[PDB]
Design a protein around this ligand. Structure first.
Ligand SMILES: Nc1ncnc2c1ncn2[C@@H]1O[C@H](COP(=O)(O)OP(=O)(O)OP(O)(O)=S)[C@@H](O)[C@H]1O
Ligand SMILES: Nc1ncnc2c1ncn2[C@@H]1O[C@H](COP(=O)(O)OP(=O)(O)OP(O)(O)=S)[C@@H](O)[C@H]1O
Ligand SMILES: [Mg+2]
Ligand SMILES: [Mg+2]
Lengths: 328, 124, 216, 124, 72, 72, 72
């Protein structure tokens, strides 16, 4: 009986292994990773929000947001974080908009960055597929999913009836890419654009572009928006952002995170660590006086940031402790 | 042409599918708004307006609704014909019959989609 | 019998299938989850209560390989539950081999029809329960009616003994943080009892489905 | 190939050349009785049935009625569409309005001209 | 035309003496719950009488075809 | 080419003195219900007169072919 | 008129009075805000080129309506 069932199951598994390979049942003990391998996204707000301390590796990721929200800068911060770890990263853009000087200002080692600017949508997807299959590039960022114009649309003239042409291309490209990514342990990030739909008649009318075949494969979809702006009396040097994890498959969704983006200097992690530590308790402020270990670190966020910058180990200790208390 | 692609309910909403029943022979632009398809009616909700039961109704594909004009609402998988009247988070689907009590639909709680506006009736 | 359940993104399809797998394992059956888009967190599955170590996971590269693996497992007369993570992800071998943006129209539909034709006869003899998870793709030119249309050809909806339609409506919150999402499952088709028996319940993250509140 | 009798001149044949406006408002004669001309009925005399100011109504040229059957009856100088109700030697032009009483015309002194049968109404 | 097309080759449509075409148009509800469906059978081929004589009838789950409604 | 081909081997298209190709394009519907079909016959091959003299006529159920229609 | 290129000086008096058709049937007091502005924008976008191809000179006439809110 049960022995007969076990024998039949063993025979079937052996035959599957013999015909296809070692891909019928994953090895039990082998596939036990304490955490899914994640690429830090340059900010504690997102690392804590995601739960796995960074975007999951081997899965499509999708960040969209209104104009000048902070998508490209976030992707560049992710690329710089990956490069500091020691993995090759490739940036493929469609709107042909990228200031490599500014990218290098953020921290990305532009000297080693495979930037492709395809003239057509199908070509961009082909380039991403080739890079993924190469198993060499570790992080892939495809910019402006809305800018992947199909070859047919370019060949035709302005005003022709090409309804739904790009959604087919997007769905097909994902159907082919999703399989290779997991094997290659890559991390593909798509940058959509918000394009309000018609006839909503009530409620949230925002609607992501590039068809809706991308929101099924996307392992984690963000929603990055710009709330205010940081002004030194007269000039603006940075903009506050608010990233909301609208979808997720590695931790509970809707873990909104907030942080500032400083032009040139990139993400302002030093202020975010202070904010988290103050509410956790590791940093004490008597209302409006920042303190730490019974010492008046000074007066002001900029002052606290300078006090932490003078001592990098002090910052790293707080960042390790906060992660160990919240992320895990 | 104007192939008939289903039937609308004049009253309680009923399921509606896109399957073509038959093809009529009236020119597409016979109606002012250029009706695209005829939707068979079913009921007596609009008897007061001249739309009795079993009378092919022409519909124009429009996603926007204006108060006071008869439209083809589509609640969930159900489609019905009523006068459109919206004053905020609530929408009233008035019926031209004392028997049929108006329908209240709250946009916040339940999604409402408008199939289009009626442009005439055939009554063949 | 074949059972196919579809719904928009983050509606709860994988969670529902994992709950079914957990029930089957608890009854004392062997279950096999043949993932399609290589998307599955074994930690989360373990949280739901399914014994991962007893569960057979596959990561088919092409569609033909995944369908063949399912057929082999069914013929084995060993596995009592087989879950295919997605039907839109079963890329036909020719499509993956070929270049991008080609006019490979219908290949996946023919593959699905063939797989169903071959598998339906073995399933009844083997008393298995193959669950196909499908996605939602808006049909252009429908105009009147529901634009929603499942993917992977229209040969699965004839064999599917019972087709569900699971959507995520609300969100349960402890004042500020979301810990679970209201779900509404509608039996859009059925051969073993009257259809259209919509049923609502809650999906608490980590703890699976909230049977206790349902009972109350 | 269907004539649109829109302008109904007083003292003019039901199918006079001047009575046809055409204007490409032409559709095929697919009506069951096979109507040979489209007549626009004006007046609220048949509001209950669905007749209005417009409601282009197709009429099939034929002289016959039975029981309560609507027809296009000519009184010599005025063209009107009313229901028919025989009384043996007198015919009643039954209408549907609380204000429009059934018009009594008789036959011994005056014989109503049955221009054609009223089948199908096109509101447009 | 009509993209819809039966399966199993086109050798059966020649021998088929009479080919029906069942479609479930509506739904019948007792207040809120569905208890039956509205079919619409169209004789699209016939070697014993003229074709295209479509007939409509209501089908009730468990009780079979609702003949008593048709008879009235 | 044209995929449509006849059955029964191809030893019949040599001996066949004249081969017709009768197709049913339209359907003459009186009012709402259909009462006849618009057939078209094309003489694809002939050995007694020039080929490809396609002819059209109406077929009325019960009565047969509508000779008066095409005569007029 | 502008299409014909015959009339070459067109005066449109009282822009304010171009009540939209969709609002004429609407009841009094309905908050149809912006309908006339949309009508005017569509009309201008539609007839701003035909004027150039001709030598017409479309002279509108508007009216003063004090606005409320900010009074800088
Ligand atoms: N070279 C630059 N110098 C200064 N500020 C910049 C520069 N590039 C971008 N920014 C600012 O950085 C913020 C975020 O913009 P980015 O995310 O880099 O570009 P983006 O807005 O995401 O791309 P789009 O057009 O919105 S899809 C905005 O406030 C930009 O004005
Ligand atoms: N690891 C996880 N931790 C927390 N919540 C999760 C996790 N994985 C999934 N969820 C949630 O579980 C719910 C059900 O989603 P899933 O069934 O896991 O994925 P899904 O429904 O298949 O999404 P798709 O696009 O349809 S495959 C959603 O609210 C997810 O956000
Ligand atoms: Mg950008
Ligand atoms: Mg899933």
């Amino acid at each position: 009986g049960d022995e007969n069932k076990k024998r039949a199951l063993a025979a079937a598994l052996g035959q599957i292994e013999r015909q296809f390979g070692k891909g019928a049942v994953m090895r039990m003990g082998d596939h036990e990773r304490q955490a899914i391998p994640a690429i830090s996204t340059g900010s504690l707000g997102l690392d804590i929000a995601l739960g796995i301390g960074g975007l999951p590796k081997g899965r499509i990721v999708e960040i969209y947001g209104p104009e000048s929200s902070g998508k490209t800068t976030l992707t560049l911060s992710v690329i710089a974080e990956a490069q500091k770890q020691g993995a090759t990263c490739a940036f493929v853009d469609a709107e042909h908009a990228l200031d490599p000087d500014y990218a290098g200002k953020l921290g990305v080692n532009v000297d080693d960055l495979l930037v492709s600017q395809p003239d057509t949508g199908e070509q961009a997807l082909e380039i991403t597929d080739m890079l993924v299959r190469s198993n060499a590039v570790d992080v892939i960022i495809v910019d402006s999913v809305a800018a992947l114009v199909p070859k047919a649309e370019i060949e035709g003239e302005m005003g022709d009836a090409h309804v739904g042409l790009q959604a087919r291309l997007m769905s097909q490209a994902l159907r082919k890419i999703t399989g290779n990514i997991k094997n290659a342990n890559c991390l593909v990030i798509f940058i959509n654009q918000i394009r309000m739909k018609i006839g909503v008649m009530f409620g949230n009318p925002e609607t992501t572009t590039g068809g809706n075949a991308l929101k099924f494969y996307a392992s984690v979809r963000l929603d990055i928006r710009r709330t205010g702006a940081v002004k030194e009396g007269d000039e603006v040097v940075g903009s506050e952002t608010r990233v909301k994890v609208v979808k997720n498959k590695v931790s509970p969704p809707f873990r909104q995170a907030e942080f500032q983006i400083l032009y040139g200097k990139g993400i302002y992690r030093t202020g975010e660590i202070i904010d988290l530590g103050v509410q956790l308790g590791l940093v004490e402020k008597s209302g409006a006086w920042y303190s730490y270990q019974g010492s008046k670190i000074g007066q002001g966020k900029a002052n606290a940031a300078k006090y932490l910058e003078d001592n990098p180990e002090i910052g790293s200790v707080l960042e390790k402790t906060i992660r160990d208390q919240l992320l895990a | 042409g104007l192939p008939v692609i289903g039937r609308v309910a004049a009253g309680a909403p009923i399921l509606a599918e896109q399957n073509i029943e038959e093809s009529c022979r009236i020119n597409p632009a016979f109606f002012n708004p250029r009706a695209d398809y005829l939707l068979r009616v079913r009921g007596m909700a609009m008897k007061d307006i001249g739309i009795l039961d079993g009378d092919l109704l022409a519909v124009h594909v429009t996603r926007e609704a204006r108060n006071g004009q008869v439209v083809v609402a589509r609640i969930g998988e159900e489609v019905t014909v009523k006068r459109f009247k919206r004053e905020g988070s609530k929408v009233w689907l008035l019926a031209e019959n004392p028997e049929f009590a108006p329908i209240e639909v709250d946009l916040k709680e339940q999604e409402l989609i408008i199939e289009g506006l009626s442009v005439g009736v055939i009554r063949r």
